[PDB]
Amino acid sequence: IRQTRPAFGGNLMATIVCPGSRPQMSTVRPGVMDKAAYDPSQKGEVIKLDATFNEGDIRTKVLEIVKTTTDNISISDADFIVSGGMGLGKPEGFELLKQLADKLGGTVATSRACVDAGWADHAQQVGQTGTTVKPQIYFACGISGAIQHIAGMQDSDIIIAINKNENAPIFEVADYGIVGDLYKVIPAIIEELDKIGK
Amino acid sequence: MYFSEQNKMIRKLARDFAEKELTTEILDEVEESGEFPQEILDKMAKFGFFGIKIPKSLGGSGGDHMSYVICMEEFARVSGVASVYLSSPNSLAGGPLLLSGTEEQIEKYLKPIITGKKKLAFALTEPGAGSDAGGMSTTAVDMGDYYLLNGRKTFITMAPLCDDAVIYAKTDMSKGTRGISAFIVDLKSEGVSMGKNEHKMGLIGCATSDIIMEDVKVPKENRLGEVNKGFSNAMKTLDVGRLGVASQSIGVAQGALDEAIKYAKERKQFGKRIADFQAIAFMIADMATKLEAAKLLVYNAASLMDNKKNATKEASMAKFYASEICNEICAKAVQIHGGYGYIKEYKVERMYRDCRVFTIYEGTSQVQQMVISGMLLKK
Numbered sequence: 001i002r003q004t005r006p007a008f009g010g011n012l013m014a015t016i017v018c019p020g021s022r023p024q025m026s027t028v029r030p031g032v033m034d035k036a037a038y039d040p041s042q043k044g045e046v047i048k049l050d051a052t053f054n055e056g057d058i059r060t061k062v063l064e065i066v067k068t069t070t071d072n073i074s075i076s077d078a079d080f081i082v083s084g085g086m087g088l089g090k091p092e093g094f095e096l097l098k099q100l101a102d103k104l105g106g107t108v109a110t111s112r113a114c115v116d117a118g119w120a121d122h123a124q125q126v127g128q129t130g131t132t133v134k135p136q137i138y139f140a141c142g143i144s145g146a147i148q149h150i151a152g153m154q155d156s157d158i159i160i161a162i163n164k165n166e167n168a169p170i171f172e173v174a175d176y177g178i179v180g181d182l183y184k185v186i187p188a189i190i191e192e193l194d195k196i197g198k
Numbered sequence: 199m200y201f202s203e204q205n206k207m208i209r210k211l212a213r214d215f216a217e218k219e220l221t222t223e224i225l226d227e228v229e230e231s232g233e234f235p236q237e238i239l240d241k242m243a244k245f246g247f248f249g250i251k252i253p254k255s256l257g258g259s260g261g262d263h264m265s266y267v268i269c270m271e272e273f274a275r276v277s278g279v280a281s282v283y284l285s286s287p288n289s290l291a292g293g294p295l296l297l298s299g300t301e302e303q304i305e306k307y308l309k310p311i312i313t314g315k316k317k318l319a320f321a322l323t324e325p326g327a328g329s330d331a332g333g334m335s336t337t338a339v340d341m342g343d344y345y346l347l348n349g350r351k352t353f354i355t356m357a358p359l360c361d362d363a364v365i366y367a368k369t370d371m372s373k374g375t376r377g378i379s380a381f382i383v384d385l386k387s388e389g390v391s392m393g394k395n396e397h398k399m400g401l402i403g404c405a406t407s408d409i410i411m412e413d414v415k416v417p418k419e420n421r422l423g424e425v426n427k428g429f430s431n432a433m434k435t436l437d438v439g440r441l442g443v444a445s446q447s448i449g450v451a452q453g454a455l456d457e458a459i460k461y462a463k464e465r466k467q468f469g470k471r472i473a474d475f476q477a478i479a480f481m482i483a484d485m486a487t488k489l490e491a492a493k494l495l496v497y498n499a500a501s502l503m504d505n506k507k508n509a510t511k512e513a514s515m516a517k518f519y520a521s522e523i524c525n526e527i528c529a530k531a532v533q534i535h536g537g538y539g540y541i542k543e544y545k546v547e548r549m550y551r552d553c554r555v556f557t558i559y560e561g562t563s564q565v566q567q568m569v570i571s572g573m574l575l576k577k
């Protein structure tokens with residue numbers, strides 16, 4: 001089996017193989033493959049094993065299991081970011097992006113235009129005066145694109161832009177670009193999101 | 199140079215005035231509360247300082263360029279922010295009106311600001327476009343009965359206090375420097391919005407923010423001169439403005455020097471007075487000769503403007519050299535005051551902070567060198 005994986009924080013791929021080892025085993029990442037065909041209801045050969053437990057042959061014993069809802073999450077710690085600028089018009093736009101960020105599991109960031117307008121707090125701002133982010137995804141929604149912003153997210157692994165005017169600089173580092181009003185584009189993005197199963 | 203006897207009189211006026219109305223008590227309150235007292239602006243326009251170079255033919259004052267520099271210098275000596283409130287209607291606001299504006303536009307726009315009823319901001323700089331003003335991104339679209347604009351301007355002096363603002367937008371996006379028109383926009387209109395006041399290091403008393411334009415419609419009757427001339431309009435205003443900036447450079451210089459030799463006469467160390475130590479006295483000399491040398495630089499530029507020959511290089515040298523050696527002077531004056539010159543009560547520290555922007559705005563010293571060398575090597 002030719003096992004491939006990313007190592008070195010994702011900077012050096014390596015195909016590690018086990019020649020003198022039987023069996024061959026590998027933890028495989030969630031999301032890389034996809035689903036197979038379901039309900040041919042082929043057969044089954046349900047085989048038995050023994051489950052022959054002992055008189056303290058399991059030293060790990062569980063007291064409680066907890067399921068938390070982690071809602072506090074720093075723009076610096078996040079893995080997915082939905083940032084919004086003056087292309088919202090109203091302070092209530094962040095709800096939309098909050099909807100977007102929730103299907104992904106990340107926070108909402110802001111540009112200076114909104115902070116100096118009163119739509120958000122400085123803790124959220126990104127750029128040279130703001131705070132630098134290196135997420136796995138960044139959403140550039142209604143931001144002109146001043147270097148004062150582009151400076152603090154240049155190394156985002158992939159940048160997706162949503163602007164009305166095509167002559168916005170942000171499309172210089174946009175890996176994927178979409179021209180339009182975000183209030184129409186944003187909800188449609190969430191639609192096809194759940195439709196495949198996240 | 200040699201001053202015409204009326205200009206010497208004007209020098210006397212601006213001296214006694216700036217000295218009498220800009221007291222220590224006031225200027226401290228201006229630094230603490232970044233608000234210049236409207237009563238003083240009115241007081242200035244009432245004696246015409248708001249209209250120095252605009253002539254009586256249009257209801258101005260009938261002075262020469264040298265009179266604008268004189269008032270700029272003698273004011274700036276006493277307070278920097280006063281100068282900012284002074285140059286705007288004389289040069290930066292009353293400039294483009296004076297060049298590419300019809301008589302009606304001048305009737306409805308210029309006389310208010312000469313009399314101090316209205317305030318006009320000269321708005322050119324964008325976040326992406328600084329030195330390279332030609333790389334603007336603000337757009338201007340022709341709809342027939344009005345123009346439609348969408349863009350953003352940073353570092354706009356006095357803007358939250360201004361009633362109308364001259365805004366440069368790109369009409370023909372392909373022509374670049376050849377395709378820029380200039381429009382007058384009433385800031386109270388639709389779409390127009392202001393950014394936060396910027397917290398600057400010095401020159402505190404005059405607000406400075408962004409002008410944000412979101413689908414703001416502007417009537418055709420408020421365009422500056424012919425279409426796509428606007429850039430040359432803004433340049434040719436920028437030359438006299440740069441004369442302004444060098445003028446205040448030379449002003450705050452004279453002030454900080456005057457505090458320098460005053461403190462150096464009065465303070466005694468090791469038994470001698472400060473000024474009797476050779477290092478100091480020579481230092482005073484050095485500052486003085488440079489200051490004069492270059493006072494002569496700038497006086498000359500303005501005299502050229504007054505006799506109508508192109509002053510585009512000479513002014514650029516004046517702004518460059520004047521602002522740089524102004525900073526050197528301001529610092530050295532701190533150093534003469536010694537420790538005490540680091541506390542805000544000693545005027546020299548306010549100067550030192552004010553005089554720092556002088557090398558950046560109105561075209562950086564680098565832009566100045568680009569202009570000058572580019573003017574000398576063409577063959």
Ligand SMILES: Cc1cc2nc3c(=O)[nH]c(=O)nc-3n(C[C@H](O)[C@H](O)[C@H](O)COP(=O)(O)OP(=O)(O)OC[C@H]3O[C@@H](n4cnc5c(N)ncnc54)[C@H](O)[C@@H]3O)c2cc1C
Nearest residue numbers: 085086087111112113127128129130143144146148149164
């Ligand atoms: C000292 C200083 C420091 C600064 N530091 C920073 C910093 O760290 N970070 C920062 O970001 N800025 C900073 N700025 C400000 C920066 O230069 C810009 O002013 C700021 O980026 C403008 O906001 P914006 O980026 O959202 O673009 P804006 O121009 O404010 O947004 C307008 C854009 O959105 C589009 N749009 C409008 N409506 C819609 C809509 N309905 N749908 C979609 N698109 C739409 C417009 O076409 C345009 O492209 C600083 C400024 C100064 C003076």
Ligand SMILES: Cc1cc2nc3c(=O)[nH]c(=O)nc-3n(C[C@H](O)[C@H](O)[C@H](O)COP(=O)(O)OP(=O)(O)OC[C@H]3O[C@@H](n4cnc5c(N)ncnc54)[C@H](O)[C@@H]3O)c2cc1C
Nearest residue numbers: 465467468472475476477478532533534535536537538540
């Ligand atoms: C933030 C701050 C913290 C300080 N903390 C302390 C502290 O903890 N302890 C302390 O003791 N002090 C402290 N000081 C004071 C500082 O150490 C003194 O100011 C310094 O030693 C010089 O004194 P002066 O400023 O009075 O200089 P002055 O002698 O009053 O000023 C004379 C000026 O002329 C020059 N000069 C002086 N003598 C001669 C000479 N013979 N020939 C030629 N030129 C001359 C000097 O360069 C100076 O510019 C502090 C000052 C500041 C601003």
